[PDB]
Symmetry: D2
Subunit: 390 residues, 4 copies
């Protein structure tokens, strides 16, 4: 069983309280699903199921994955469900949809992730009531999306654990965060984000606004701007607003069918899916996931690391990214070539569906036979997926 990605589409990544400040995630998910179908000329009524990862659904209504699907006119017959591997959420959904087809329980899947971090509420358990005293209204975005459940600290503190263990400096992490801005701003001028991006219409009261640009890419980054920042996590630390990724909005997807099914419908696929994998690492050093998780995908497929021609390794942080870059020892010239999540941004639940899209469209453009996407996960996991263009 060979399961292909016939099409792929992603919204631009927005900035926290930015383009998509008041846009429910499922609206963004609605546009990517319509966009994969439109691109593959498959009608929404041919879609068996919609699998969207999502970390931050509080307030958004029953099963926002279904809410996306219905708004893109996937009929009532089809099915939709969410899931959560935090930041591996959006790429694991592609694996799960891939698995729906190899097991012969669905014919055509649309799988990705969606994320409105801007729209995440504050919350508090108030059923028993609060007999007396102050309490905290909690930011679900931070609590459910960015804080470890086991130690109680921010994910910036787990990338910092990788900065002392691998001895990565404050200079070296500025040289990756600037080099991801530089690579990404080049990309954006060059139009290389055009193909993958499907524009989204933010419906306003005094005028619509079509968003087709990733707005968290700061233009023309020097080094002295990065190296004059103040650590956001430790107070004698090395991770900062500039070498860590952002908080973002965004949705992203891929359209799945068997390889036989694409070629019947006259569809030249972006890739085949050849393997994946998911492993666990010490939570304290959660950024290291992409290492064992790339290894096991690369073993399953039957590929080495030197084989690879193109790689996305989500830059949740600059500490974690460099560490996965070092241990695996692959050519860093082919890694995050149109930049990564520092510059682009990091919409948690969508982000793995993002870097899958960037790789598949850049793989097409440049002529790379073998790609790899990978994402470190909070709690200490890694996830990966080896691709092969036809």
């Amino acid at each position: 069983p060979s399961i292909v990605i016939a099409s792929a589409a992603r919204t631009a990544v927005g900035s926290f309280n930015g383009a998509f400040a008041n846009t429910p995630a499922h609206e963004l998910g609605a546009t990517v699903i319509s966009a994969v179908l439109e691109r593959a000329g498959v009608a929404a009524g041919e879609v068996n199921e919609v699998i969207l990862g999502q970390v931050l659904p509080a307030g958004e209504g029953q099963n926002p994955a279904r809410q996306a699907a219905m708004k893109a006119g996937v009929p009532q017959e089809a099915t939709a469900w969410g899931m959560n591997q935090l930041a591996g959420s959006g790429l694991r959904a592609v694996a799960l949809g891939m698995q729906q087809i190899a097991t012969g329980d669905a014919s055509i899947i649309v799988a990705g992730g969606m994320e409105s971090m801007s729209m995440a509420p504050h919350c508090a358990h108030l059923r028993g009531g609060v007999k007396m005293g102050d309490f905290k209204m909690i930011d679900t975005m931070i609590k459910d999306g960015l804080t470890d459940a086991f130690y109680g600290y921010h994910m910036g503190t787990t990338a910092e654990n990788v900065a002392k263990q691998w001895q990565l400096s404050r200079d070296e992490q500025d040289a990756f965060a600037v080099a991801s801005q530089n690579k990404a701003e080049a990309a954006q001028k060059d139009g290389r984000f055009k193909d993958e991006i499907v524009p989204f219409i933010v419906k306003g009261r005094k005028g619509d606004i079509t968003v087709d640009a990733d707005e968290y890419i700061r233009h023309g980054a020097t080094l002295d701007s990065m190296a004059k920042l103040r650590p956001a996590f430790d107070k004698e630390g090395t991770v900062t607003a500039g070498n860590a990724s952002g908080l973002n909005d965004g949705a992203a997807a891929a359209l799945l069918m068997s390889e036989a099914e694409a070629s019947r419908r006259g569809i030249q696929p972006l890739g085949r899916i050849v393997s994946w994998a998911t492993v666990g690492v010490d939570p304290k050093v959660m950024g290291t996931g992409p290492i064992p998780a790339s290894r096991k995908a690369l073993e399953r497929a039957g590929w080495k690391i030197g084989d690879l021609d193109l790689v996305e390794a989500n830059e949740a942080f600059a500490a974690q990214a460099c560490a996965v870059n070092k241990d695996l020892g692959w050519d860093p010239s082919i890694v995050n070539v149109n930049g990564g999540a520092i510059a682009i941004g990091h919409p948690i639940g969508a982000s793995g569906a993002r870097i899958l899209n960037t790789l598949l469209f850049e793989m097409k453009r440049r002529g790379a036979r073998k790609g790899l996407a990978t994402l470190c996960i909070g709690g200490g996991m890694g996830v990966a997926m080896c691709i092969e263009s036809l």
Copy 2:
């Protein structure tokens, strides 16, 4: 591939704000995880991945699937995620774990669902700031759990729609409710729930308490007690609190491995998952969900409906319950043999693993060979699984 349910367990079901009014889901989760590990004779350190369905995770923190696994003594090298097909979730995860093994990506999965509706917070988007005027604190249990996202009313109003369609009188709905309470009260006194129930110790400042008994079952439910209430959703309707299920907290799971992997180890499985299916219908009549699902399941197993010896079909509402039974035509004596959710309760994400456990253990207890699990789903779906005893 031929996967088998080696072991299974669940907590008792808690009343709304009752025994587990302050117990986080993942705590209830860890207890059921430890349970199936110990019941199969597999050590936590052999588990590859934990899949928990869960509908209402806001405030609990990062990926409660990982929190339940790590607490239960599963080692950091394994992985963990959750998902949301609403009331279908807890059975869906078992099917999702079956595909990991079938696809050659996991040896051994723990799969089920967990839900604390007690612990679901209220919430509000408060980033913009509220310059003036009231804003709503939104009950996430009601918003994300029980409210249709397209039609804007409760699930119980969809039960009015199904009742109106199927011409199911109030007197009929109350007679299904009282039976389901009478079956469950009978099964409680007779220890038919003891096997599957694993006690949960609620730790407290002032005394540990062991919960080993479903507390939502009302003893000696009479036809008058059901017939004295008012309609809860429609002011000239039929659906009341007596003939719908409640708001509850619990968890439930199953350790899945290939059939061969069980034999090596001397485990006597509680079932082979022969076939599974999920179908979509109109959100207005979401209770009809089980109908196309149970029929597609049966088609995938190559079974006729008259081949089943046992059925658990989830009792969200006595209106939809009566109707699903009416269509499929199976003997109602082999349906919810030990009562259903009206009596036992309806902890949403957990329900699908809840009824599966119930089916598995009565399937063992009476020597039934063929069994089917099914659940209706908000926003217009159903899910279903055949189990066959070894």
Copy 3:
């Protein structure tokens, strides 16, 4: 000018989240206004102004004093206002009422206080908009009621400051606390709170409840009960939940008019206001306020301490009550004869009027000619009033 208290009344004092847990303060106030009218034989039409002290009106709506008056049927042509000198309020309002009549601006005043500490809300300033992370919902009872504005600590910490300066042992404070409970119980049992209490009907869906007993008074309070408690404010402190007053709900009032006005109407008044005073003291030892205030009241009356026949000195804390009695040196057997606030409760803005009602109705029953009510006040003040029988 010679001003009399023609009539007085109070609700029973409710326990925190007890009998009045969901009764707005103005509803309690409305019953006492109606009662002082009924007791004097004065019609609501004849009232000029209602003045009600109240510390925690947040969320009750515009000017709760006007709500209470309107509810009691005081005509729209009268006026009403609220005021806040913390625990002084309910007494200070009476003096303020006296001054309307003494300056010829009113003939007929209803004055006192009202408080629902149970109904006091949690709050936060949210107009700016909170960009990110967690914020504090503030208990307005604690913040606006019980915390010193200059030093940041609870009123109980000022009770420790007084326990330290006056060298007041834990066992001395406990014996006082116990004696307060035992004298309150004896008075309650003997019917001594009957004349002052007007019953309050708590209107309830499933039945109305008449509350006519002070429910905070513990029956059979033992010295061992007090002795076993942990210090509530300082870990090597002496002040506990037992030897401090509680958090409580109630209202109390007095109907005033000139002595010649009472004479024409043939009313036998409860008392003439001979004098009153308010003084400040250091916030840190706020419980000492009654010292300077009572001395100043007595000076203004032309009375010696030895001339008093009965005293209500409010029992915020055993520590401060003991300091006060020690310094003034009045005969302790004439002070809080029927118990005090440790036993009865401390509904802040209402307590001044509460202990005036107690003073006035014991004065009448025992035939005492000369009386004095006094209270300490948060932020460092006291208030005192001298009453003589006609």
Copy 4:
């Protein structure tokens, strides 16, 4: 007994979330207390009591009046309290101050009001808990300040009710509004608010800002810009954002003492308090309050309406201001000569002292012998004060 206002002062009136956006009301009051002292040449040590009207003190901590007085160096031996008669507050506190001196209980009183509508929190009663279903976080500014407690509608609705009863057109309201702005602008440019205003230093982190101008006053207000607004309260209405006052922050105060005392000190007082009055009306038409209150004040003074040389009548709403002027029939050319609240702003509990400050300083400037200040009050009341020059 003759009471004089020896001195007076006010902060500039701040725009809602404008200059004083994060300044607690007691900090504004502390600056005005300091200023009346300095302007009278009276030391803070000689103050007996501070009395500050305030409607919205939730979350500011214990008795903000005491907080203001202490910050101003008023010694701990003095006393301070707050009161609430809504927009009547800041004036009635002055009459209450007078009465303290008039009955021989104090020699020296600072009295007025302070309000921060910007700092007023949102709130909710959460003590019992919220077992299920949505609940509102209530804007305390709207709930406690601006909503009628009997009818449940905003004060702007009482204004409409007055517009309809007095048959006041939109065009007439708009005219009056534009006249208020144009007159306030003129008075501001010409320096007429300089004497009354004390500057307030907003303490910053990146620099202090000195505020000494009333920032709500729109410069170059056009009739067109009033006329184009949509009714704010009634969709076929008349009352708009433009012909209503605003939501504002500010404080104001007067230092009082006897006339014989000011003579001893050699103070030339701003005025003698000759009479005051407060009267109730129907809540539905509360804007009319000033009518019977001014009449009652004039009758107490022994004055005819035509004896007045200057008047401040608060402009809560153009509709009610116009009705007041119609029924009383005083020359509109002597009313709100420097504009009113539509232009200047309406910090509720501070406004009655705000307009007293404007009457007094204009009375001084023009040599006007007889004045009157009056306000309407939510819930159906009025307050008025007569002032004579010495």
